[PDB]
Amino acid sequence: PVKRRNNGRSKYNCGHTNIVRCQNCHRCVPKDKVIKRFTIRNIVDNTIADDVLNACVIQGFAIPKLYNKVQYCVSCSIHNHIVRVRSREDRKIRTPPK
């Protein structure tokens, strides 16, 4: 049986996509199939943010954010709970949930 119309990849009108590597596994994964969750976090944890913010002698400097695109291989994603195995019914849902 064919599990997904997409085939697990977003390749449309193309025959090849640029390879990327899992950040955790290091497996080469075509760009279309990578999980690709972008994260914008803070340079220090919120629990330390209060104390760092008090420490700074500068007038108005916020803890500067860290931006990284994490791209994960399928196995790395299911093991680290980035994505979950869903039912044939909910597999179609595309909107980011929670």
């Binding site: 972008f38 914008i40 340079i43 500068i58 007038q59 108005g60 400097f61 500067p64 954010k65 860290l66 931006y67």
Partner: protein, 223 residues
């Protein structure tokens, strides 16, 4: 800190003074060892480079200033003061990430800029495209003709602004942010564009005996 008072015992601190353009010229104190062998303390502190936020340089609006960081290098250790000159300008890594958003197209230009003082500089300029005020289509993608019109606009404007510029005024143009603003006016007419600014300005070639220039920049508040 260690002169008044095992390796640190034999040391001294020689204060570093920034170019006159910056409101807080005093920046830091550099640790040096006491003279031994053929290793005089002044020779070691002569070519060190310090990276200073424009917020620390001109203390004021962090939002409008602290994102840019200037590299200033000692050129003369005179009167115990490590006088410094431009070694580069750069936006912080946090500014660099904040500028990129999926759905947008990025135009990024680099130009070799020649100065009267004999420095070849490299301007790394970053630009981004944004949504129109009343646009149904969600993604801010521009057709190729506009991107090339935009690429030309930054290249032409940079010749107009930094083409005949000398290092002393360039440092003030880079710290007053006029060049970023002229580039935004030029790009604005072509298409709505955001974050048009210079990401970095680095010295490809530095002239020798730049000491007369160093006097004009570090000192000579009049000039």
């Amino acid at each position: 800190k260690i002169t008044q008072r095992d390796p640190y015992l034999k040391k001294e601190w020689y204060p570093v003074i920034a170019p006159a353009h910056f409101k807080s010229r005093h920046i830091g104190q550099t640790p040096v060892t006491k003279t031994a062998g053929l290793r005089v303390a002044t020779d070691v502190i002569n070519h060190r480079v310090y990276e200073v936020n424009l917020g620390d340089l001109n203390p004021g609006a962090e939002d409008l200033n602290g994102n840019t960081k200037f590299y200033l290098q000692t050129q003369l250790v005179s009167d115990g003061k490590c006088l410094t000159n431009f070694h580069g300008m750069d936006i912080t890594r946090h500014k660099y990430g904040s500028l990129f958003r999926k759905g947008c197209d990025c135009i990024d230009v680099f130009m070799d800029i020649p100065t009267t003082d004999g420095y070849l500089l490299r301007v790394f300029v970053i630009a981004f495209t944004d949504r129109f005020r009343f646009q149904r289509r969600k993604n801010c993608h521009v057709k190729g003709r506009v991107i090339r019109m935009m690429r030309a606009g930054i290249y032409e404007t940079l010749h107009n602004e930094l083409g005949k510029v000398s290092i002393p005024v360039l440092v003030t143009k880079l710290s007053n942010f006029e060049v970023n603003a002229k580039l935004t006016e030029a790009l604005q007419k072509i298409t709505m564009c955001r974050d048009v600014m210079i990401r970095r300005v680095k010295v490809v070639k530095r002239p020798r005996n730049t000491m007369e220039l160093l006097s004009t920049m570090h000192d000579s508040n009049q000039v």
